[PDB]
Amino acid sequence: CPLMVKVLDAVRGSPAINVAVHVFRKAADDTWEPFASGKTSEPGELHGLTTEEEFVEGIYKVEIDTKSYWKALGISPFHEHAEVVFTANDSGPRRYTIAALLSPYSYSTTAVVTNP
Amino acid sequence: CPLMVKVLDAVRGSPAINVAVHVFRKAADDTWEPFASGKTSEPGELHGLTTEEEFVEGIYKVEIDTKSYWKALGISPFHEHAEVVFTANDSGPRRYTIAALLSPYSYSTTAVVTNP
Amino acid sequence: CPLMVKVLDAVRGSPAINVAVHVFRKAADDTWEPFASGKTSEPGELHGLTTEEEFVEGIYKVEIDTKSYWKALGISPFHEHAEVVFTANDSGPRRYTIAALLSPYSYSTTAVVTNP
Amino acid sequence: CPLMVKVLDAVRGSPAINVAVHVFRKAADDTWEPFASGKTSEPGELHGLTTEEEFVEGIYKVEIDTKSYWKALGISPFHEHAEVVFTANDSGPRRYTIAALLSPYSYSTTAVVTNP
């Protein structure tokens, strides 16, 4: 798993479950092309997005469908989605965790990059 | 001001100066049209992006060029930029402050929305 | 002002009004002596806590009564309060802004430190 | 494990390793008495602080020794420590994760409370 997404709900103090997440990779022609997607699990995580072979260096975007999550809870949100845009770099072996901490009018995102 | 952006540096405990900011508005053909741009000042703020008249209802994207900010300080950060995407003015004119708090591998962004 | 506190509500996207704040200073006998207190105003700010003369070097604690804030809105939050503990003025007078961004089960706090 | 602590470094994008963490419980006489402590592991976590039997309802404080962590990295920090103060509540079965995301001049803390 070179790429995992973890989403937390700062209002309820809980994993954010059933959050849609879409990953895109920037193509040679500079448009965003679909790469992987899924929905977060009960632990708030999305595993199995990609493989070491497929996850080559390049620019990626992770879009987290925050608005739909809040709407499901009846809470009026600010953002359409949370967007995380980064370059994958081969720099020796690496695993990327993209974490997001959600509130209705605020989010934080952190990258935890480790070497197994 | 109907739209202001404020950027803070969590490493230095200071406003983030000279950060480039680009604002886009989603067009009828679902493309991101350039709307406004500027750079943060010494207090870490960007004022004067738009006017109440020009700032109509729509979906806006505020792009904060965090990578260039970090690189100029000698840090190779994780993200390319911070993106903030939101519907504005859909229940009438509001004033929006988009704040961002920057660290090399993490950022948070908050919206403060007031009714004039 | 040598010390200002600003508090934002991440649920509502608004300043956090009427939040009680208590400031302490560590005494020679290592107890926390009351230093100043107040409540945030409509812009979510608390000004006028102290003066450059009174705000000597020391270890200070800013206690933000977040629990009472949430409870008044109908939310049972996780934390009792937010505590911010720091050495101040040890390389001469500075101006400190202590910011806090509140959610029911999460908060962040940032310091912006400037030299007048 | 009814109580776990997880600490992340927002500057390096990594778990925060070898961070001292002290837990206190508020005694009948209203003073803070030592309850548990340890240092974070390579994954940035501290497990095994307490047991279900010992972790009774009451007010707890988790102190995270952030200053020492930054100092070890040669980075000048703002806070003496990060302090998390909360009431443990029996509300059916519960597991508490106290997460902290560290920057030199800012931290966030989140409680993730789940039911196994």
Swiss-Prot record, chains A, B, C, D:
Result, substituting residue 41 to R: In AMYLD1; amyloid polyneuropathy
Entry domain remark: Each monomer has two 4-stranded beta sheets and the shape of a prolate ellipsoid. Antiparallel beta-sheet interactions link monomers into dimers. A short loop from each monomer forms the main dimer-dimer interaction. These two pairs of loops separate the opposed, convex beta-sheets of the dimers to form an internal channel.
Outcome (variant: residue 40 to A): In AMYLD1; amyloid polyneuropathy
Entry protein name: Transthyretin
GO CC entries: azurophil granule lumen; extracellular exosome; extracellular region; extracellular space; protein-containing complex
Annotated effect of mutating residue 61 to N: In AMYLD1; amyloid polyneuropathy
Effect recorded for residue 85 to A: In a patient with amyloidosis
Effect of residue 49 to H: In AMYLD1; amyloid polyneuropathy
Family: Belongs to the transthyretin family.
Consequence of changing residue 50 to K: In AMYLD1; amyloid cardiomyopathy
Phosphoserine PTM sites in chain numbering: 43
One GO BP: phototransduction, visible light
Localisation: Secreted; Cytoplasm
Miscellaneous information on this protein: Tetramer dissociation and partial unfolding leads to the formation of aggregates and amyloid fibrils. Small molecules that occupy at least one of the thyroid hormone binding sites stabilize the tetramer, and thereby stabilize the native state and protect against misfolding and the formation of amyloid fibrils.
Oligomer and partners: Homotetramer. Dimer of dimers. In the homotetramer, subunits assemble around a central channel that can accommodate two ligand molecules. Interacts with RBP4.
Effect the entry attributes to changing residue 9 to G: In AMYLD1; leptomeningeal amyloidosis; leads to unfolding and exposure of N-89 to glycosylation by STT3B and subsequent degradation by the ERAD pathway
Effect of residue 46 to P: In AMYLD1; amyloid polyneuropathy
PTM description: Not glycosylated under normal conditions. Following unfolding, caused for example by variant AMYLD1 'Gly-38', the cryptic Asn-89 site is exposed and glycosylated by STT3B-containing OST complex, leading to its degradation by the ER-associated degradation (ERAD) pathway.
Function: Thyroid hormone-binding protein. Probably transports thyroxine from the bloodstream to the brain.
Effect upon mutating residue 60 to H: In AMYLD1; leptomeningeal amyloidosis; vitreous amyloid in some patients
Effect of residue 101 to M: Loss of tetramerization
Outcome when changing residue 115 to S: In AMYLD1; uncertain significance
Molecular function terms from GO: hormone activity; hormone binding; identical protein binding; molecular sequestering activity; protein-containing complex binding
Record: residues binding L-thyroxine: 6, 45, 108
Whole-protein coverage range: 30 to 145 of 147
Phenotypic consequence of residue 105 to C: In AMYLD1; amyloid polyneuropathy
Substitution effect: residue 52 to K: In AMYLD1; amyloid polyneuropathy
